[PDB]
């Protein structure tokens, strides 16, 4: 019956409502912590010299 | 009937709540004092050149040298980014090839779309001629996105509301994850590949345990369909383009989206998206064939890559983060550095 | 300079070039066409002489010129995410049927309702259309005793049979907002099949000259 | 010498030197545009276009640095540079206008293979073939008109410096004779032929029932008479100079229309050219200054 | 995979004879070809090279001219066509296949060999020892000298190690001086400082006694070393 989809949401739904739950402070720290640790090892952020880019100019 | 219905609509109230209760300062006001990224100008260097129609996906090997893109003349081209050598060229059974993927091994590349159907090829056959490893049927659809997890597993999103993970040696999907309302469009592993997140055209995205085979969370707030997903390098947060013109980023602890990286100029959609190694740049290529480079915690328009003349299709940038490569509609990739 | 290695692995590349370049000067050479129409307009009809769940591709070889013909129907998922694949396509065929007036749930509506958006999608602007209106029989045999007021509001001079398919091809055509840029062609199959091959032959070389008319500038 | 003052004097040379101005301006943007829309587009580079390229350059070639001293050497009725410049201005006019005509030939023969044999012009206009053919025009002009480096002076029937009419008239009407037949079949043939295939297509298709292919045709074949069928024929009748002046001068002059109106023609009317060169403006000065 | 050469026997000196050998089992018309002779009781040398497609022919300086090098993809055959022949030229012939593009594993398969007898500047590569003893369960090492530096400014340092076993066809055990061929036991092991390298054997079993040859591919020329033999 049609009545299965209308469980399968809420099925799903409720067990959203049980997930872990941090503030979204946090989520920004780590985001910021991991983008300022690995800032040297970003050949795109901080360009390499040529003596270390694989892709030469030619 | 309408008290499953009442019942949803209450779970959903409920996770709202939830979710703005969380939400006590955004990420905008939480990066203000932290300095923005210079201009980002990058030139190309190197043009890839060789493909005779409309690029639909390309992927970088993990060795950041070798990267397969796939075309819709009916050809996936195994290029040397260093020399621009073709290393493979291998004609496809169907040339409608809507996504293309390499294996993290290097060993395999797999490939589907309007056919419904994930060909694997092997490279390092005995012969020395690219075949077909094997060829996944199941989906009612085409297949949007195709990636590798191992040389014997794969997932798979298709436009038939559903994703798939398979056993490639059994030849049959091991599971298959539901709960999509439209055609399921992009589909990112985690660094990890413990889980993965798949963006369909109904606009919203959803977090999937490969092995627990269900999704864990859901992921709304565009107004259209979302045609692209990234991981960012950490694993905890995903950035996300839709055909609405803006693309968006979430943590999947916070389970909502951090920031949004609209704009004035932009009025088109974004068919891909890339963080780079550091994921303080968010690549992302748009339908007015120019990429666009954003500074990933501000939001400001830090770059644009504008050396393509047909709509931007995929873009990729290497495991180690060298250089981004971009291809489009004009049947060309350019290698930014 | 480079290694030995080095340079053959360059004649190795220039090689694959080769032969891409061989494979896309045929590629160029072979018509495309796009089939669609409605669930039982007649696709199948069509494809039973050019015979002679995903994208259904089949190939034949008529006065010397190859045809790819791409029936695409049989996937049930949202088209603006795939239809783009198909800009390059020579044509579009389009089929519909006549015996469809008395259809109602209406559904030659449903048909000239389709037949608008493959007109006007931003892809298919150049893109010609091919208009298969098939089941004339089913439609002469109808239009003496069902006349075309149950269907449309107003109706051709007279529910005779030659005005009635006159008036319907006017409508059809009419639906075309790029007259300037695209022509639809017109075929009137009465399971007449054998000339249906002929027809499109004939339909797509108008097509591909006034191709070539645009490439060398003489259009 | 180096006097063309009139025998007869009639002030003609100010139009000459008004017409030669025009073709200097129209004959040079509308060419340097045409180089710059097929340069800075690859896309546009095509085999095809490439033919259109070499003209393009060939008329450029005139228009730029030799129409000048045609307006000059007119207005004072004499040669102001040097006497050895010449006959390297002689050269370098007469294998311009030779690139120009096989170019224009050249181009007939794709057109026509395009239309009516899809098939064959990959073939004989490969990577290979579309080379040899833009390098044979220049070495065709080159040879055919490098002998006559002696017999270069500043004729004064036409107040400019080609070759001398009397004195090489074997070989000069030779080539000349030559060049008109060529020129003159094929592109009359080459776009009869296209017309022809174009309305047969037509004709078949509408026995189904229940364009200005044939003005762009009148235009090209009109366009190349009018500019070279007076000239070369004035010069094989006339072949002991005995005609009056102007009419040797308006028929020079008339050769002058080539220069300034095939980027029209071949370049400005054509789709692609029109549509890249449109993409470029629109899309503002960046394709200078960042591509 | 399998290549099976022919027209062996005896020649008389001076004449001219074809050899030929049967590509099975693989691509034939993507791999570059080459011939290796082997002198009765002495090592290796290269004879020639033919690339994918016939595009690059190369001979060595002990031939050329001699000798000429043929592909017929069609029949996946390779022929080999020698004039004038000579004393030195009495030889087993192996026909080794060699695919060239990134990553690629150079010389991996080799023919069973031809027999050919016949009646009565370059890079010099220097191998340790004739010989060497070992017992099984050790481990044992060979050393390696090349007249130039390998490596190449790409970084690669193209040195290649065969192993021979008595009566089979040499096979490839490491390419480009580190890289393990495929089917090679973990056992085997490469290194190098450019111009001097090393091929180093862990819990050495019965069976890896024969010879074990060093080749260079950084210049056309190719050159093999004297060969060195390990024995129970
Ligand atoms: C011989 C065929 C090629 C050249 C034919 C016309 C010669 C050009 C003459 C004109 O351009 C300059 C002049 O004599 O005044």
């Not at chain 2, 088109?268 to 120019?290: H, P, W």
């Not at chain 4, 500043?154 to 090489?168: E, K, M, Y």
Request: net charge positive; glycine share 6%; charged share 20%.
């Amino acid at each position: 019956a049609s009545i299965a989809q209308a469980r399968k949401l809420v099925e799903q739904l409720k067990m959203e409502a049980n997930i872990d739950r941090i503030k979204v402070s946090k989520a920004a720290a780590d985001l910021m912590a991991y983008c300022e640790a690995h800032a040297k090892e970003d050949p795109l952020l901080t360009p390499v010299p040529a003596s270390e880019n694989p892709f030469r100019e030619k | 009937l309408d008290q499953l219905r009442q019942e949803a609509e209450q779970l959903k109230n409920q996770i709202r709540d939830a979710r703005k209760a969380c939400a006590d300062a955004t990420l905008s006001q939480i990066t203000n004092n932290i300095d923005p990224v210079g201009r980002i100008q990058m030139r190309t260097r190197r043009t890839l050149r060789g493909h005779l129609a409309k690029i639909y996906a390309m992927h970088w090997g993990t060795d950041s040298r070798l990267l397969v893109s796939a075309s819709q003349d009916g050809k996936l081209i195994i290029w040397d980014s260093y020399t621009t050598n073709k290393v493979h060229a291998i004609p496809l059974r169907s040339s409608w090839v809507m996504t293309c993927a390499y294996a993290p091994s290097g060993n395999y590349v797999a490939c589907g779309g309007l056919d419904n159907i994930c060909s694997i090829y092997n490279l390092k056959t005995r012969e020395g001629n690219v075949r077909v490893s094997r060829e996944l049927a199941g989906h009612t659809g085409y297949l949007s996105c195709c990636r590798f997890l191992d040389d014997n597993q794969i997932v798979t999103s298709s436009g038939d509301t559903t994703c798939a993970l398979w056993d490639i040696e059994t030849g049959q999907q091991t599971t298959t994850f539901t709960g999509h309302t439209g055609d399921v469009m992009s589909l990112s592993l985690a660094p990890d590949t413990r889980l993965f997140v798949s963006g369909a055209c109904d606009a919203s995205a959803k977090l999937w345990d490969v092995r627990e085979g269900m999704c864990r969370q859901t992921f709304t707030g565009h107004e259209s369909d979302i045609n692209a997903i990234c991981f960012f390098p950490n694993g905890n947060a995903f950035a996300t383009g839709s055909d609405d013109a803006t693309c968006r980023l979430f943590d999947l602890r916070a389970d909502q989206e951090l920031m949004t990286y609209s704009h004035d100029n932009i009025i088109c959609g974004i068919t891909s998206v890339s963080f780079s190694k550091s994921g303080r740049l968010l690549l992302a290529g748009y339908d007015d064939f120019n990429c666009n480079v954003w500074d990933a915690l501000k939001a400001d328009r830090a770059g644009v890559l504008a050396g393509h003349d047909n709509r931007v299709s995929c873009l990729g940038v290497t495991d180690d983060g060298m250089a981004v490569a971009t291809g489009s509609w004009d049947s060309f990739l350019k290698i930014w550095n | 300079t480079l290694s030995a290695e080095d340079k053959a692995a360059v004649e190795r590349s220039k090689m694959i070039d080769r032969n891409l370049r061989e494979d896309g000067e045929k590629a160029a050479r072979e018509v495309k066409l796009l089939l669609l129409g409605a669930g039982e307009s007649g696709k199948n009809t069509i494809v039973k002489q050019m015979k002679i769940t995903g994208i259904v591709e089949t190939h034949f070889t008529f006065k010397d010129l190859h045809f790819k013909m791409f029936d695409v129907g049989a996937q049930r998922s949202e088209r603006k995410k795939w239809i783009h694949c198909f800009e390059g396509v020579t044509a579009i065929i389009f089929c519909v049927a006549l015996s469809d007036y008395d259809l109602v749930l209406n559904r030659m509506h449903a048909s000239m309702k389709l037949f608008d958006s493959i007109c006007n999608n931003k892809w298919f602007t150049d893109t010609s259309i091919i208009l298969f209106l098939n089941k004339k029989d089913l439609f002469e045999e109808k239009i003496k005793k069902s006349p075309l007021t149950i269907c449309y509001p107003e109706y051709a001079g007279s529910n005779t049979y030659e005005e009635a398919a006159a008036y319907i091809q006017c409508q059809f055509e009419d639906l075309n907002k790029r007259k300037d840029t695209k022509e639809i062609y017109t075929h009137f199959t009465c399971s007449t099949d054998t000339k249906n091959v002929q027809f499109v032959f004939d339909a797509v070389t108008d097509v591909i000259i006034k191709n070539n008319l645009k490439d060398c500038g003489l259009f | 010498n180096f006097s063309c003052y009139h025998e007869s004097v009639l002030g003609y040379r100010y139009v000459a030197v008004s017409w030669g101005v025009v073709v200097a301006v129209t004959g040079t943007v509308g060419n340097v545009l045409t180089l710059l829309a097929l340069a800075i587009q690859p896309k546009l580079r095509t085999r095809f276009n490439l033919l259109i390229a070499n003209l393009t350059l060939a008329d450029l070639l005139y228009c730029t640095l030799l129409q000048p001293f045609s307006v000059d050497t007119y207005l004072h009725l004499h040669w102001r540079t040097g006497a050895t410049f010449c006959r390297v201005f002689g050269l370098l006019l007469f294998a311009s206008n030779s690139v120009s005509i096989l170019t224009l030939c050249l181009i007939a023969l794709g057109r026509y293979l395009l239309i009516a044999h899809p098939k064959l012009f990959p073939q004989v206009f490969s990577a290979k073939g579309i080379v040899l053919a833009l390098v044979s025009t220049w070495v065709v002009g080159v040879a055919s008109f490098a002998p006559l480096w002696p017999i270069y002076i500043l004729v004064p029937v036409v107040c400019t410096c080609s070759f001398d009419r009397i004195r090489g008239r074997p070989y000069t009407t030779i080539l000349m004779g030559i060049y008109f037949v060529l020129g003159l079949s094929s592109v009359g043939i080459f776009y009869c032929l296209i017309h022809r295939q174009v309305k047969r297509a037509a004709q078949a298709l509408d026995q189904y029932k229940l364009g200005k292919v044939t003005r762009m045709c009148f235009a090209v074949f009109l366009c190349f008479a009018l500019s070279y069928i007076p000239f070369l024929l004035l010069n094989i009748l006339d072949a002991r100079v005995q005609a009056p002046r102007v009419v040797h001068m308006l028929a020079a002059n008339l050769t002058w229309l080539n220069g300034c109106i095939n980027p029209v023609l071949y370049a400005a009317m054509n789709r692609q050219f029109r549509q890249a060169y449109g993409s470029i403006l629109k899309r503002g000065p960046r394709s200078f200054h960042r591509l | 995979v399998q290549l099976v050469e022919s027209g062996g026997g005896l020649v008389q000196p001076g004449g001219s004879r074809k050899l030929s050998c049967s590509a099975s089992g693989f691509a034939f018309s993507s791999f570059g070809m080459h011939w290796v002779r082997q002198a009765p009781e002495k090592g290796l040398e290269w004879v020639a090279y033919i690339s994918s497609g016939s595009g690059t022919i190369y001979y060595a300086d002990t031939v050329k001219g001699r000798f000429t090098i043929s592909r017929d993809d069609p029949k996946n055959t390779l022929f080999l066509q020698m004039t004038s022949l000579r004393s030195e030229d009495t030889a087993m012939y192996y026909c080794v296949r060699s695919i060239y593009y990134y990553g690629s594993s150079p010389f991996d398969f080799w023919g069973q060999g031809t027999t050919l007898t016949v009646s009565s500047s370059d890079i010099v590569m220097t191998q340790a020892t004739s010989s060497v003893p070992v017992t099984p369960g050790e481990s044992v090492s060979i050393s390696c000298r090349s007249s130039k530096s390998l490596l190449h400014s790409n970084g690669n340092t193209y040195l290649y190690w065969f192993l021979q076993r008595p009566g089979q066809s040499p096979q490839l055990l490491i390419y480009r001086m580190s890289n393990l061929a495929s089917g090679v036991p973990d056992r085997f092991s490469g290194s190098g400082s450019g111009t001097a390298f090393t091929l180093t054997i862990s819990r050495l079993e019965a069976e890896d006694v024969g010879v074990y040859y060093c080749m260079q591919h950084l210049e056309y020329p190719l050159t093999f070393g004297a060969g060195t033999k390990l024995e129970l």
